[PDB]
Amino acid sequence: LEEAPWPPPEGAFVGFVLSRKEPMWADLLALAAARGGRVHRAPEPYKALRDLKEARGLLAKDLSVLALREGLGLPPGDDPMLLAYLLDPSNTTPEGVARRYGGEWTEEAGERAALSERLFANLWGRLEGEERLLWLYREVERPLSAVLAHMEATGVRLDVAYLRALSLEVAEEIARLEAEVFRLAGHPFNLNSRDQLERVLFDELGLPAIGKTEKTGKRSTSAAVLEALREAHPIVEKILQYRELTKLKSTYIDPLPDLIHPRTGRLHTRFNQTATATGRLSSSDPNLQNIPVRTPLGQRIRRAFIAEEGWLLVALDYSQIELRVLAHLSGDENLIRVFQEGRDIHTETASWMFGVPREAVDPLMRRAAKTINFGVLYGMSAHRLSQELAIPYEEAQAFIERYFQSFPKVRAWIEKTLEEGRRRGYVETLFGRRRYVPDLEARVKSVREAAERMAFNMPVQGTAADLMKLAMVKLFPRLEEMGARMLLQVHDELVLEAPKERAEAVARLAKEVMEGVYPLAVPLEVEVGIGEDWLSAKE
DNA sequence: GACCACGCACCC
DNA sequence: AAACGGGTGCGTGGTC
Ligand SMILES: Nc1nc2c(ncn2[C@H]2C[C@H](O)[C@@H](COP(=O)(O)NP(=O)(O)OP(=O)(O)O)O2)c(=O)[nH]1
Numbered sequence: 001l002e003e004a005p006w007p008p009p010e011g012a013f014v015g016f017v018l019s020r021k022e023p024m025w026a027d028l029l030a031l032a033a034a035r036g037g038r039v040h041r042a043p044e045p046y047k048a049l050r051d052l053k054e055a056r057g058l059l060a061k062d063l064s065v066l067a068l069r070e071g072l073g074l075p076p077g078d079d080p081m082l083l084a085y086l087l088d089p090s091n092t093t094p095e096g097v098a099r100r101y102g103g104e105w106t107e108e109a110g111e112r113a114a115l116s117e118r119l120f121a122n123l124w125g126r127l128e129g130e131e132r133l134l135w136l137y138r139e140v141e142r143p144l145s146a147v148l149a150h151m152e153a154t155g156v157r158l159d160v161a162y163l164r165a166l167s168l169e170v171a172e173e174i175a176r177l178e179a180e181v182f183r184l185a186g187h188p189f190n191l192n193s194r195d196q197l198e199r200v201l202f203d204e205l206g207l208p209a210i211g212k213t214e215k216t217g218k219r220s221t222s223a224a225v226l227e228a229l230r231e232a233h234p235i236v237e238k239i240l241q242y243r244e245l246t247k248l249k250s251t252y253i254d255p256l257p258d259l260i261h262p263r264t265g266r267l268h269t270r271f272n273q274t275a276t277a278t279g280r281l282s283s284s285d286p287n288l289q290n291i292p293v294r295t296p297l298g299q300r301i302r303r304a305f306i307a308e309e310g311w312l313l314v315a316l317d318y319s320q321i322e323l324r325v326l327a328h329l330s331g332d333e334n335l336i337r338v339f340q341e342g343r344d345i346h347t348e349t350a351s352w353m354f355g356v357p358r359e360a361v362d363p364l365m366r367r368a369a370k371t372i373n374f375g376v377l378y379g380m381s382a383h384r385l386s387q388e389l390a391i392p393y394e395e396a397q398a399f400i401e402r403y404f405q406s407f408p409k410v411r412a413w414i415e416k417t418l419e420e421g422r423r424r425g426y427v428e429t430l431f432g433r434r435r436y437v438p439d440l441e442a443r444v445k446s447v448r449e450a451a452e453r454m455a456f457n458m459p460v461q462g463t464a465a466d467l468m469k470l471a472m473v474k475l476f477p478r479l480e481e482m483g484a485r486m487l488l489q490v491h492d493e494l495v496l497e498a499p500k501e502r503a504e505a506v507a508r509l510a511k512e513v514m515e516g517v518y519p520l521a522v523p524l525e526v527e528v529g530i531g532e533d534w535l536s537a538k539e
Numbered sequence: 540g541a542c543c544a545c546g547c548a549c550c551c
Numbered sequence: 552a553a554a555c556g557g558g559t560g561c562g563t564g565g566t567c
């Protein structure tokens with residue numbers, strides 16, 4: 001390309017180099033743009049940001065986030081990553097997309113700008129005639145990248161003093177647990193080393209081994225194995241408690257307070273838009289989509305996520321979303337009727353599991369029932385089911401039969417989906433998002449059936465992801481107009497922040513947007529709560 | 540310091 | 552652990 005002076009004309013493709021991957025923390029080392037056979041390199045990248053009207057190119061959102069961090073409203077535009085991701089969601093990295101569609105991902109901004117321009121041309125050509133993928137690009141993914149940029153740059157408030165104090169309390173309990181484990185073992189060892197623990201449990205204490213690990217075939221010490229040995233030896237209970245506390249302390253309590261951004265005073269995640277095989281987002285650096293919630297200590301951690309003073313959090317979560325999506329995709333008349341009647345399949349399974357009235361189903365029971373319902377739907381074996389519920393094999397097998405017999409068009413839809421995936425090589429969501437699953441014709445049954453479970457899961461999970469993304473795109477401008485903020489997405493959940501005086505109106509509006517985003521054969525219902533912290537906002 | 544593979548625990 | 556699916560992060564153990 002012909003080198004030309006900064007600035008570029010409108011519409012040019014940008015390239016940029018960051019000191020580190022996280023745009024809220026990165027130094028902008030270099031900036032360039034490409035257009036019309038020319039490449040323009042910025043003499044000083046920070047000041048040069050002011051000259052761009054739009055971030056157009058590879059990883060556009062990340063540059064937008066850094067721009068917003070610097071007080072500049074630079075929206076992301078076209079991004080070849082999003083085109084490639086829609087053609088094939090195994091396209092997750094700029095390294096791979098470049099090699100696949102016509103260039104090389106280097107560490108030079110000018111080359112990244114030229115690469116962005118070339119890949120856009122080629123990928124746009126590949127999408128010619130792919131009208132449904134183009135709709136997803138123009139109506140979902142490209143607009144969503146601007147929404148995600150704002151979310152990332154906004155961040156969430158965290159009670160750091162609370163977590164610092166909690167760390168000290170948990171440390172004293174961990175010491176109690178580890179001392180007791182070492183006493184029971186008859187000697188100390190590194191309780192964090194599962195290789196050392198394996199020897200203690202199965203060689204020294206002679207406990208029965210229950211299962212093997214996947215890659216190396218060691219005797220497993222995982223929670224599922226420990227729970228089966230709960231009554232074999234008192235050390236097991238102490239190990240399980242140690243495992244929970246150290247996981248929670250090492251992954252959430254201790255690291256998160258150290259990640260508060262000095263300019264914003266908030267915690268900033270990344271919402272990765274080309275990272276999953278189904279069209280879901282992921283979250284990283286830190287992941288704010290796996291914050292604890294199930295146990296009492298996990299709930300204490302979730303309470304650390306708080307609203308700004310004068311504001312409230314609003315949490316919205318789709319009811320039984322993938323079961324509702326399944327009703328629409330399969331067209332099963334009975335399952336459609338279940339939700340037209342306002343029934344709750346998780347609560348109903350929980351009532352049966354624990355043998356108590358629906359009135360008596362607490363959140364832990366419903367959570368356990370959720371796992372059973374989706375486990376069974378997506379191919380859980382009768383053997384594992386019998387083991388999960390502590391019930392005879394014949395009973396577990398009968399539960400599965402009753403599950404599917406109730407909704408006969410589901411199995412028909414599954415077999416239709418698999419046959420189509422075999423013939424086409426890909427399955428697709430309601431909106432046409434594709435996942436390629438070539439192993440559907442593998443000659444090794446274990447490999448083939450694993451591919452099958454991946455394949456017929458994707459239209460369900462992926463359609464739910466499409467709906468959530470579309471809802472975010474529609475909701476974001478409404479929140480801006482109301483002075484409210486979108487903070488987090490957790491797959492079928494949004495966490496908003498609203499001024500106290502408008503929180504009720506925001507909750508009502510967001511619920512209506514989410515419920516009416518794209519009507520299905522079944523109503524979409526959204527549970528909504530308001531509170532000063534994330535846990536209290538989920539009722 | 541970095542990378543990785545792995546087992547394991549976090550959530551939807 | 553197992554014929555549920557989709558993810559990320561930590562510590563260990565090994566390596567460079
Ligand atoms: N295959 C699979 N999918 C899962 C699992 N857990 C969650 N998902 C998928 C399927 C879920 O539909 C979706 C959202 O998870 P929730 O919001 O925690 N549960 P839901 O929306 O069903 O019920 P409600 O909100 O009324 O309590 O994520 C699981 O164990 N397995």
Ligand SMILES: [Mg+2]
Binds near residue numbers: 172
């Ligand atoms: Mg204390």
Ligand SMILES: [Mn+2]
Binds near residue numbers: 318320321492
């Ligand atoms: Mn839900």
Ligand SMILES: [Mn+2]
Binds near residue numbers: 490493
């Ligand atoms: Mn949810």
